[PDB]
Amino acid sequence: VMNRLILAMDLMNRDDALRVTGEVREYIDTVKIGYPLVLSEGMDIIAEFRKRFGCRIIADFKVADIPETNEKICRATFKAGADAIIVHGFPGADSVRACLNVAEEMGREVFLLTEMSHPGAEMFIQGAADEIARMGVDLGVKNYVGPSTRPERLSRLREIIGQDSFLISPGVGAQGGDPGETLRFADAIIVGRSIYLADNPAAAAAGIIESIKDL
Amino acid sequence: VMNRLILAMDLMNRDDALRVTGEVREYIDTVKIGYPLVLSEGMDIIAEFRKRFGCRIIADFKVADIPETNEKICRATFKAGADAIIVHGFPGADSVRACLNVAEEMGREVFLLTEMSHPGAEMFIQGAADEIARMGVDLGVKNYVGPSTRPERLSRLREIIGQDSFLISPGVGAQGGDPGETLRFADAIIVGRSIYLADNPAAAAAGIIESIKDL
Ligand SMILES: Cc1cc(=O)[nH]c(=O)n1[C@@H]1O[C@H](COP(=O)(O)O)[C@@H](O)[C@H]1O
Ligand SMILES: Cc1cc(=O)[nH]c(=O)n1[C@@H]1O[C@H](COP(=O)(O)O)[C@@H](O)[C@H]1O
Secondary structure, three states: OOOEEEEOOOOHHHHHHHHHHHHHHHHEEEEEEEEEHHHHHHHHHHHHHHHHHHOEEEEEEEEEHHHHHHHHHHHHHOOOOOOOOEEOOOOOOOHHHHHHHHHHHHOOOEEEOOOOOOOOHHHHHHHHHHHHHHHHHHHHHOOEEOOOOOOHHHHHHHHHHHOOOEEOOOOOOOOEEOHHHOOOOOOOEOHHHHHOOOOHHHHHHHHHHHHOOOO | HHHEEEEOOOOOOHHHHHHHHHHHHHOEEEEEHHHHHHHOOOOOHHHHHHHHHHOOEEEEEEOOOHHHHHHHHHHHHHHHHHHHHHHHEOOOOOHHHHHHHHHHHHHEEEEEEEOOOOHHHHOOHHHHHHHHHHHHHHHHOOEEEOOOOOHHHHHHHHHHHHHOEEEEEEOOOOOEOOHHHHHHOOOOOEEEEEHHOOOOHHHHHHHHHHHOOOE
């Protein structure tokens, strides 16, 4: 990922989302698009962004259903042009395998979300996260998401998945995570509001990149 | 819910989804619409169904993000005309509260998914399910989802939530659950493929209702 920075584009208006993404395009080459934008503007927004910006698109859909439904969700998401999809591991191995099967059929990638970044993640997810990660390894998952807000947990996730696996990390900026510390363990950081709510998103992205190059 | 039966409309084509829903409308008055249909046909499908069929719509979006994103997802879903949304409890109390806050602002309902119906649910979700349910009670959740495939677990969920709470249950038919047994504990059953993949969906729905009235 260009500059190890992934934009979390969670504005809910097509015009604002296009404006911000265009302003920061030189600093990124991967955009994470989730349900706030998709449920407001339609799945066609994925192919529009892919074309206009020539970026890779990660669909952050936190897929968390039974295996049969997960297959349908993944098929629709890849048909819409997403390069990868984020999948929850908490629903278990069969649900993750269903997503892996569709990604294999369509030449795409799955990212497994193993521990979340918000405070509530401590209640149930944290205590399962190591086992969710190990499940990922045993299923052959190569791409993972873990939390910038808890770098000791990010270190433990990296320990389980090994150095060859790709690890991206949200919670930088707004949720309190630090870019440099997070990049001790993650390959790339995800940043949303610290960029897209800034008075000058390009200057915000540049500031982050400047602190990244210093590592 | 009319006849204690909720149609899980997970066909991915608007014409087929409209045909089946129209054929079974006399047997139901609540349609559950999820991401297979929404990500294939757009969020506008919710208002279309609500109008054409005069049904209640439950958006089965298994909301499972951080609190800030959950608020955006719920706002977009209610703006699209959904009467209620299904929310995962596994991400913790703050994530569930975010959904409850938006439902309160917009005069809608949250259904909390506490234990899932597929085999993988045994790995991580089952061991947290009682505590997820108790969390729901403490947050004031009044609507719950639990698994037809494990009626002993459905009984335990009913025990925690009490008789006044509303409980709906998927996994009937295709996944192996039984309508009558499930309705010992749930107020309503969700049925998808046993109806929408049948040669005659109306006859399939009628058959289920006939076995329900017998209780
Ligand atoms: C992928 C994900 C997992 C998670 O544990 N935490 C998280 O924030 N996310 C998403 O990353 C983005 C974080 O954005 P900011 O906090 O930087 O605004 C939002 O899209 C969240 O939904
Ligand atoms: C709500 C939900 C939770 C869950 O634990 N199990 C489940 O099947 N679902 C959904 O119910 C429906 C079950 O459909 P059939 O198995 O009856 O086809 C699908 O939409 C599933 O995504």
